[PDB]
Amino acid sequence: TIESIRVKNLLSFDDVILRDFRDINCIIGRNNVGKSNLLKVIRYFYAKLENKKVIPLDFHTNYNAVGEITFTFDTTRIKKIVTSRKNNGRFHKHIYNTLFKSSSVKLNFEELIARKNSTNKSFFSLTLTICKDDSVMWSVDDPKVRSLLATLYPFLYIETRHIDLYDWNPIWKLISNLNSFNFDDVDHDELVNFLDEKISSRKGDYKKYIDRVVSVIDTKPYTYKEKVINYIKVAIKGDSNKFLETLLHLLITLTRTEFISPIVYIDEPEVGLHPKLAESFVSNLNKIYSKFKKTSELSGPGRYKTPYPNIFYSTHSPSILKQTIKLFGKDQQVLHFSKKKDGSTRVNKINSTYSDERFLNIFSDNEARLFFSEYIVFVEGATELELFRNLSLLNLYPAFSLADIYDANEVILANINPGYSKASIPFVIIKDIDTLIDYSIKTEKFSLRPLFEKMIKELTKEFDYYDTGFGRVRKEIDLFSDIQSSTKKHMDSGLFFKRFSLHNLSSRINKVSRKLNRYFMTTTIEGALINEQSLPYFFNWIGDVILTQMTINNPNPDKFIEAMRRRYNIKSQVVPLFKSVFCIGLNHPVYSSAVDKQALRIKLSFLNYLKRKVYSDFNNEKEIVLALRLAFGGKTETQYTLDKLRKDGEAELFREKIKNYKNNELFFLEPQMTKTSGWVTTFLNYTIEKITSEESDDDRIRQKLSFIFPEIISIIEQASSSIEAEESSLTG
Amino acid sequence: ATLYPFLYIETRHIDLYDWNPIWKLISNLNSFNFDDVDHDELVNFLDEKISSRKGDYKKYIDRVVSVIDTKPYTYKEKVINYIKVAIKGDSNKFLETLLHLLITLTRTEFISPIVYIDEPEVGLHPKLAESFV
Amino acid sequence: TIESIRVKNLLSFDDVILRDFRDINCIIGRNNVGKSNLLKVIRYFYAKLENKKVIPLDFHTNYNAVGEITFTFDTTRIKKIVTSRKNNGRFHKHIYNTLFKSSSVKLNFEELIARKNSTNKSFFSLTLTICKDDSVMWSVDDPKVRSLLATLYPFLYIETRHIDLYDWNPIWKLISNLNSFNFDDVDHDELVNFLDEKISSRKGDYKKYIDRVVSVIDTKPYTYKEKVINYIKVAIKGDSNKFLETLLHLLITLTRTEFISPIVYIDEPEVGLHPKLAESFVSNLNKIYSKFKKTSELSGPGRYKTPYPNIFYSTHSPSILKQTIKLFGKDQQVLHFSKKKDGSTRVNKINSTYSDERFLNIFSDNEARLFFSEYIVFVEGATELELFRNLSLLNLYPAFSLADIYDANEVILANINPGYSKASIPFVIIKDIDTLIDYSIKTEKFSLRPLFEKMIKELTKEFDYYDTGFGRVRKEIDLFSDIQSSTKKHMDSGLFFKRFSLHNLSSRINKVSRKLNRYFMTTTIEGALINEQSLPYFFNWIGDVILTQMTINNPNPDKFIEAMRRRYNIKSQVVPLFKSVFCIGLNHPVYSSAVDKQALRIKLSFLNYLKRKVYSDFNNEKEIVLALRLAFGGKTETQYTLDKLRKDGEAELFREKIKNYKNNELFFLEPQMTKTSGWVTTFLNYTIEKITSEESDDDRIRQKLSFIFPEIISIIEQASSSIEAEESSLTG
Amino acid sequence: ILVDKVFYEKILSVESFKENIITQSAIPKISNKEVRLISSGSKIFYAINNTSPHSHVQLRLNRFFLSHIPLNSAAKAFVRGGSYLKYLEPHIYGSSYCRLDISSFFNNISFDDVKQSLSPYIKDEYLIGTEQKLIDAILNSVGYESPIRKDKGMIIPMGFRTSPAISNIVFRKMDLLIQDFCAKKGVIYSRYADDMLFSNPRESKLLMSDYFIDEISSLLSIMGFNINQSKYISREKEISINGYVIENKGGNGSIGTIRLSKSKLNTVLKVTHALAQNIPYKNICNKYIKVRLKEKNIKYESKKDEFEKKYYRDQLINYLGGYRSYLISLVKFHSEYKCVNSDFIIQINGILNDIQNHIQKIKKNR
DNA sequence: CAAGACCAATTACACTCTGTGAGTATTAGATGAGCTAGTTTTT
């Protein structure tokens, strides 16, 4: 039908070109002005095709004297129809003479015409030129070609926001233009006589009535359009979303037996519609699309092989987009508009075809939301989703609130393929350092993962020349290649590195992979949360949990407390008393003043005891951080977890210390030591509240957060800087 | 109401793109019975007289109706459509035609309507108003 | 501050009562007619408050001669304002002369002493009755009371689909009504003199021009509203989403030093808006809501404790609802309307407050999509998401597509609490039997999970009388209690049951738990797919892989095949030859005719060999089903997985056979033998394609699917029946 | 809905009145020996035999025919979804209250009114030849000629299962007339069976005036209904209807409250107190619960006896559970409408806790 | 006693006359068992 649309120096388009049109085309983007301007360009071109006096479009810049609109039509099916010897009608000969005759006389019939009769496609290019003096120039200097193109590849525009339910003009126009019946053979007098014979007695009374009516009114005779519309209205037994669906269905049904291939543009198909209604609309469109398909073994009556008309959608709803993707697949595309740096509409294609059927079926609203995004943060793990979606943290960083976070593994990333649309949708993939380097305690070896080798191969400057601006890329690649060795011996029984530092390697990897839209963290997200600087806040959170978590199991608090004090020692047997008195409970009943004082004293004593035991058990204020990290499913600097250490058998004494602390000392926190336990959200909220209470201005709070959380604040600030650097283009 | 109907014609705010009073008068003021006529035979005849083979136009109409989900016409709408098909045609001229049609229709019926025309001379030459009267 | 709106026998309401109104009340549902009727009722009530000649609303049925609209206003703040001694003002006296006057003068000197405890709330009820003769009368016959109620609690309607940007009528109306300045003291002559002095070539030059202009345009004098509007316009320096946001901000800012409590109704705030735009709108509303809030430590200038006006939303976009739930939290509610069986609008509050902060923070588009649903199927596992979202299966059942599949564990289900919204959004929770009962090989005894005991406790109908039919529930409960015996012999090394059948127990559990919206499967999700009746098709699927997913590695196929045949035996060494010839490759190159024939012969020989080995190693024809089930992370009838069996040291020979098939024969299927590998989607697609090729009619295809997959089709049919039972209710 | 001959062929008379339809037999009336004439006070209840075609026809009429005819919203009795609590709810907004009762409501319903009310919903076609129509065939299963009331026509029995629906359907014109009359004067009207409750929110003496009674009597005289002056109650700011107290302090929109007086809950408190005092179950059910074994115990067939103890356990458990259901119906009504006193709510919560404890004690003892 | 106010729901011109609303004038395992039944309103 149509292949390319090129707009130069008109409205907001500078050198914009649109190509590769599928059966269904979805237009999305935050720049509504671009979509409106494209619609205006198309409508102006089709109005000038039909010779309608309309105001010429405005130029993008007045320093250009020419504005071009270029339309390329795929005139391959119609060429085959008119070339065939069987078809020799008046219209076929007219089409052949006005389009496929000028290009045929210039080609030899013995060789060129024989060679062109193959699977190759033929295109017709038409250019509209607007000059400074409001003058219109055409590539072809004859109205017949333009008129035939207008009546052969028509453009229909449907606006749902401003639609009339009582108006059926587009439907009747389309029905009249999609009829293969000659209505000139119908005799008006015979029809009037037939009506008169079967209306009443005294044959001729209805004829006299009609004669009187026409003699009184005496208006212009009905045109062919009016006559066919009236005949259709009488023949049929009767006459927002329903109107659009009916029009689209009748258009698809009536184009099965006609060579006319229209172009439909629907603006906002989801206004005033339930999400289920939009999904049902797309489902009905796909059902009627597939009802008239004759491919491979699928055949029989009611099946047509005619190409479907091109349909364009201006949608702001993820439901329509996801249904279109899941239902069509290879027969759809997604267009993102956005803008440029100086201000100019773009048109890019976002990946919508997936080779994984599982991803296509699982596809839900979360996946469809990535299309309507300006910055995507890709994470592997639900803990990162909890951290980056924290409302308290996002309140202090409004810029990062504009970026949406998606949980994807390598398979989901490969299916989505964010690299296809980088300018349209900037993205960053946040991963951990264990997907690049592998370490073993039994054998000293810094092995390289296949992903790291693939990155090295991609960054290998083969088939290249000199004149590199800055950065010893080759030296960095060589150093990363030779890092595989048997050095950096263990320290403290496979828990630290004697001299090697992962911070420098992580920084180098991040610097190299900035151009790859990838960020690798030094440790897991737990290491970024609980570090040597956040220990006071983690201890305060533990104290708050102790204070406002456990209650008295016994209905009578005073009697139970007195009995336990008289039975269990308050100093030597403090732990058994705490275990047998305080229990985890959602409700927090209010006790007496003496009972509350005793409970507060016991809680303070327990806090002091645990703090003293932690300080006097571990060596320095570094093993506490590692112990807490491994407690919450974390990793050490040797890339080992508690489960992996158990399967291996290293750091047995430290593992016994952890088991003793979990089973005896910290038993109320045991349910919160899981990844899907929500401890991240609670800890972040408590830290934010405490910092807000201490400091006054928001800048001080942000500085304190940067001091406490280096990596999280660093990545948030980097994403915010990227967003603010590319905010003008990705904003309407 | 049905024996002494009231009609109001505002010439100043009249529209030339609609004929609502005319079609209302035509539908209401009739002495026929547009019920004996049946859609099936109408179609059958149109199919026989239109083009191509037998039954093609009937199949086209059936497939259009089956996918439109529209309620059937009322009697007034059906008679309006029949009159529109049976005739060959679609400020001062509009008013004169409406009055002539109403008088002609009311010359064979006991219905005696009452017409009220507001400002029959807006945008009219004095000769045009005299010619209207 | 309304607290109750009651509509009886008007439009589409028979008896509908709305209560517990909050700040950000949101309205969702497919019954748009109900929302329109509610808006019409509110607008009619407020028009009749101001004595406007309007058409009375139609009755729901003509067999009632009365149509009532009841409005209850929370007159607690106003009563406290006007009761205080230091509020001697004309308007304050007017308020405490018409509203709080009849309920005070008729009481003794004791009742009022209990109304000054700062704990009670005062309610004012006003009823509008429309009679059969189009006559309307009120409960209180005092126009002053109605006018004062309209002034104190005004109603504002904002329409976004049809909004005029040029006219700012609501803004100027709010500015004129919400002010604390008296404009009657302004001297017009003084202002004109000042303007003349500002621009004066001579003393008294602009005065004569003003007098001439007034004389030549002499009309009715300006009203107070016009004067204040003009003064505001000359005082200010400046005149869809932006307009509404500015209006809402102005209304919120104005209602900070006034006791007027407006009511705001906004219809479709997201029409023609990007999802990010709607989210930003809700975020800005939350920011302006929180900026003017003072709580304990939060104080200082610019923050007020004045109650916020009630805001009503009519949104079809999940983005607005998601942001409202995430940001506002406890200060919002969701109202689902739907319909009744005979046809009548309902109103039900959907759960929108969550006690888990993690769930609120990671709240996403899927969770907001669950509220725009008519049937939710809750599943635990991504395999169920793959199976129940399969496109090739939903087309054959055009009734289960209306149901939305959500993956949720027990915690997510508890947070969502689907039982709160049961008559509005029907739901089914699909779980496995293993979540109710457990089995141990070492200690041959059943055990009851806490979930099953909790369900039994919920089903124990104590505190009950004797009723017919409700007698077998106690017997079923007693049987479910006593099935805890250890008399259950297991054969085949603890893989099957000698006499016990889990099918009957699962059927009984499903029968008793139907009333609790829970369905428990006999086996795991892989059990319903890999069964005896699916053995042929499954085998064919394997063959498909051997014919599709494995191609020759060598670039020259003929030479490599000849070398392998001359080197490796075709019969004894067939397995090594097959392993060394065919590898993993997406491309499917076409070879020579002889090469294709040889490859087809080799593939057929390998398929026959594997079929014979499977039928020979296992004899009962059923142990193969269990082997395949445990291969794809399944379970046995003893509720044991392959990993659990390995840890428990049971069925060593079976594990050895499984390892032999995995590492020796079915090595190409090893990537697909894990969860989330997409094997479910491929298997369903292949089975449905084969059945479609075999059976012509769709009913035959559905019957064959029911035969091969009994549990899946049973669940689908049950859900479809549940949907179609309430189809006339949950549909616009 | 409309019922034609085919509808009555296999829905209302699918098996019972089938042999009469095929063999051109007119459907007979209800014989004297086919009903019982039980007595309670000065009231006669007509009990139809359980094993009879007319009983099945009445069940099918009540399930299929007398369930789709529209009724008036003021009819809060004998209607699916109606209750006494809904009958008393609308009057919380009023300050003055008036109670009236129709005398012999079921006995004063003329059969001609029933016929004319059911005529629009039944096709006027002959059923059994040109002998009997379809309307009278339906009516023969509804009414009954009362020998006590002589040959005064087919009086609707007070014990038939079809009587309440027929009464509510026939009392629709009167409901509309009374509702319109009260609407013209700002009076809330609600009817339960034959008790009419009127509420006036305004400070007026319309309900205590003789004009209101005269107007209600004049309206009711259209269909021949009277009201007895024995139980005419007109009060202000408080009214007690069978223990249900509606109280409104008055004002210009004040909300009233609904509670239950100590007289209504005296029996359950006495039962709980007796259970607290360890009173034997022999005299706690034969005195308070008015349930007692007859002389013809164990059907005069068994010899084990000892069923008295288990009977006095069962029936006591049933009474406690039923009254608990009553109280929790009250609290659910409060949750739905918010028109019940808070102190009454806490009192019934305490009573419910006591009842649950006593039920647990009884079940532990058994 | 006797009573105003008694529900709602259930597109059309035949005629001889083709124009009129009459005038006429056409016109023709089958055999000991052995069992109760809520609160409240109407009533």
JSON list of N, CA and C in Angstrom, two decimals, chain C residues 174 242-256 281 284-285 287-289 291-292:
[
{"chain": "C", "resi": 174, "resn": "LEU", "atom": "N", "xyz": [-14.45, 30.43, 42.14]},
{"chain": "C", "resi": 174, "resn": "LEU", "atom": "CA", "xyz": [-13.77, 30.10, 43.39]},
{"chain": "C", "resi": 174, "resn": "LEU", "atom": "C", "xyz": [-13.10, 31.32, 44.00]},
{"chain": "C", "resi": 242, "resn": "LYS", "atom": "N", "xyz": [-2.83, 20.77, 32.62]},
{"chain": "C", "resi": 242, "resn": "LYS", "atom": "CA", "xyz": [-2.33, 21.96, 33.30]},
{"chain": "C", "resi": 242, "resn": "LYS", "atom": "C", "xyz": [-3.47, 22.80, 33.86]},
{"chain": "C", "resi": 243, "resn": "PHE", "atom": "N", "xyz": [-4.54, 22.97, 33.09]},
{"chain": "C", "resi": 243, "resn": "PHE", "atom": "CA", "xyz": [-5.69, 23.75, 33.54]},
{"chain": "C", "resi": 243, "resn": "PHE", "atom": "C", "xyz": [-6.31, 23.13, 34.79]},
{"chain": "C", "resi": 244, "resn": "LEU", "atom": "N", "xyz": [-6.56, 21.82, 34.76]},
{"chain": "C", "resi": 244, "resn": "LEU", "atom": "CA", "xyz": [-7.17, 21.16, 35.91]},
{"chain": "C", "resi": 244, "resn": "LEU", "atom": "C", "xyz": [-6.25, 21.19, 37.12]},
{"chain": "C", "resi": 245, "resn": "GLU", "atom": "N", "xyz": [-4.95, 20.98, 36.90]},
{"chain": "C", "resi": 245, "resn": "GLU", "atom": "CA", "xyz": [-4.00, 21.02, 38.01]},
{"chain": "C", "resi": 245, "resn": "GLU", "atom": "C", "xyz": [-3.96, 22.40, 38.65]},
{"chain": "C", "resi": 246, "resn": "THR", "atom": "N", "xyz": [-3.94, 23.46, 37.83]},
{"chain": "C", "resi": 246, "resn": "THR", "atom": "CA", "xyz": [-3.95, 24.81, 38.37]},
{"chain": "C", "resi": 246, "resn": "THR", "atom": "C", "xyz": [-5.23, 25.09, 39.14]},
{"chain": "C", "resi": 247, "resn": "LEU", "atom": "N", "xyz": [-6.37, 24.62, 38.61]},
{"chain": "C", "resi": 247, "resn": "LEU", "atom": "CA", "xyz": [-7.63, 24.83, 39.31]},
{"chain": "C", "resi": 247, "resn": "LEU", "atom": "C", "xyz": [-7.65, 24.12, 40.66]},
{"chain": "C", "resi": 248, "resn": "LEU", "atom": "N", "xyz": [-7.16, 22.87, 40.69]},
{"chain": "C", "resi": 248, "resn": "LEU", "atom": "CA", "xyz": [-7.12, 22.13, 41.94]},
{"chain": "C", "resi": 248, "resn": "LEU", "atom": "C", "xyz": [-6.17, 22.78, 42.94]},
{"chain": "C", "resi": 249, "resn": "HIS", "atom": "N", "xyz": [-5.01, 23.25, 42.48]},
{"chain": "C", "resi": 249, "resn": "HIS", "atom": "CA", "xyz": [-4.08, 23.92, 43.38]},
{"chain": "C", "resi": 249, "resn": "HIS", "atom": "C", "xyz": [-4.68, 25.20, 43.93]},
{"chain": "C", "resi": 250, "resn": "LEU", "atom": "N", "xyz": [-5.36, 25.98, 43.08]},
{"chain": "C", "resi": 250, "resn": "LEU", "atom": "CA", "xyz": [-5.99, 27.20, 43.55]},
{"chain": "C", "resi": 250, "resn": "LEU", "atom": "C", "xyz": [-7.07, 26.90, 44.58]},
{"chain": "C", "resi": 251, "resn": "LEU", "atom": "N", "xyz": [-7.88, 25.87, 44.34]},
{"chain": "C", "resi": 251, "resn": "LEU", "atom": "CA", "xyz": [-8.94, 25.53, 45.29]},
{"chain": "C", "resi": 251, "resn": "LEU", "atom": "C", "xyz": [-8.35, 25.05, 46.61]},
{"chain": "C", "resi": 252, "resn": "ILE", "atom": "N", "xyz": [-7.29, 24.25, 46.56]},
{"chain": "C", "resi": 252, "resn": "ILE", "atom": "CA", "xyz": [-6.66, 23.78, 47.79]},
{"chain": "C", "resi": 252, "resn": "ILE", "atom": "C", "xyz": [-6.05, 24.95, 48.56]},
{"chain": "C", "resi": 253, "resn": "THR", "atom": "N", "xyz": [-5.36, 25.85, 47.87]},
{"chain": "C", "resi": 253, "resn": "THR", "atom": "CA", "xyz": [-4.74, 26.99, 48.53]},
{"chain": "C", "resi": 253, "resn": "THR", "atom": "C", "xyz": [-5.78, 27.92, 49.14]},
{"chain": "C", "resi": 254, "resn": "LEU", "atom": "N", "xyz": [-6.86, 28.19, 48.42]},
{"chain": "C", "resi": 254, "resn": "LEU", "atom": "CA", "xyz": [-7.91, 29.06, 48.95]},
{"chain": "C", "resi": 254, "resn": "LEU", "atom": "C", "xyz": [-8.56, 28.45, 50.18]},
{"chain": "C", "resi": 255, "resn": "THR", "atom": "N", "xyz": [-8.80, 27.14, 50.16]},
{"chain": "C", "resi": 255, "resn": "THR", "atom": "CA", "xyz": [-9.46, 26.48, 51.28]},
{"chain": "C", "resi": 255, "resn": "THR", "atom": "C", "xyz": [-8.45, 26.15, 52.38]},
{"chain": "C", "resi": 256, "resn": "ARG", "atom": "N", "xyz": [-7.68, 27.15, 52.80]},
{"chain": "C", "resi": 256, "resn": "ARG", "atom": "CA", "xyz": [-6.76, 27.02, 53.92]},
{"chain": "C", "resi": 256, "resn": "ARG", "atom": "C", "xyz": [-7.05, 28.00, 55.05]},
{"chain": "C", "resi": 281, "resn": "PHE", "atom": "N", "xyz": [0.31, 14.18, 37.69]},
{"chain": "C", "resi": 281, "resn": "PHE", "atom": "CA", "xyz": [-0.85, 14.90, 38.22]},
{"chain": "C", "resi": 281, "resn": "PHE", "atom": "C", "xyz": [-1.19, 14.42, 39.63]},
{"chain": "C", "resi": 284, "resn": "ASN", "atom": "N", "xyz": [1.50, 15.65, 42.03]},
{"chain": "C", "resi": 284, "resn": "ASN", "atom": "CA", "xyz": [1.36, 17.06, 42.38]},
{"chain": "C", "resi": 284, "resn": "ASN", "atom": "C", "xyz": [0.20, 17.27, 43.34]},
{"chain": "C", "resi": 285, "resn": "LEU", "atom": "N", "xyz": [-0.90, 16.54, 43.14]},
{"chain": "C", "resi": 285, "resn": "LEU", "atom": "CA", "xyz": [-2.01, 16.62, 44.09]},
{"chain": "C", "resi": 285, "resn": "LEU", "atom": "C", "xyz": [-1.57, 16.17, 45.48]},
{"chain": "C", "resi": 287, "resn": "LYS", "atom": "N", "xyz": [1.48, 16.26, 46.65]},
{"chain": "C", "resi": 287, "resn": "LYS", "atom": "CA", "xyz": [2.42, 17.25, 47.16]},
{"chain": "C", "resi": 287, "resn": "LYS", "atom": "C", "xyz": [1.70, 18.46, 47.74]},
{"chain": "C", "resi": 288, "resn": "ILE", "atom": "N", "xyz": [0.68, 18.96, 47.04]},
{"chain": "C", "resi": 288, "resn": "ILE", "atom": "CA", "xyz": [-0.06, 20.10, 47.58]},
{"chain": "C", "resi": 288, "resn": "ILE", "atom": "C", "xyz": [-0.89, 19.68, 48.78]},
{"chain": "C", "resi": 289, "resn": "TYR", "atom": "N", "xyz": [-1.33, 18.41, 48.83]},
{"chain": "C", "resi": 289, "resn": "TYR", "atom": "CA", "xyz": [-2.04, 17.90, 49.99]},
{"chain": "C", "resi": 289, "resn": "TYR", "atom": "C", "xyz": [-1.13, 17.86, 51.22]},
{"chain": "C", "resi": 291, "resn": "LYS", "atom": "N", "xyz": [1.87, 19.48, 51.65]},
{"chain": "C", "resi": 291, "resn": "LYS", "atom": "CA", "xyz": [2.54, 20.73, 52.00]},
{"chain": "C", "resi": 291, "resn": "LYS", "atom": "C", "xyz": [1.76, 21.51, 53.05]},
{"chain": "C", "resi": 292, "resn": "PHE", "atom": "N", "xyz": [0.43, 21.46, 52.98]},
{"chain": "C", "resi": 292, "resn": "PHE", "atom": "CA", "xyz": [-0.44, 22.19, 53.90]},
{"chain": "C", "resi": 292, "resn": "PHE", "atom": "C", "xyz": [-0.93, 21.32, 55.05]}
]
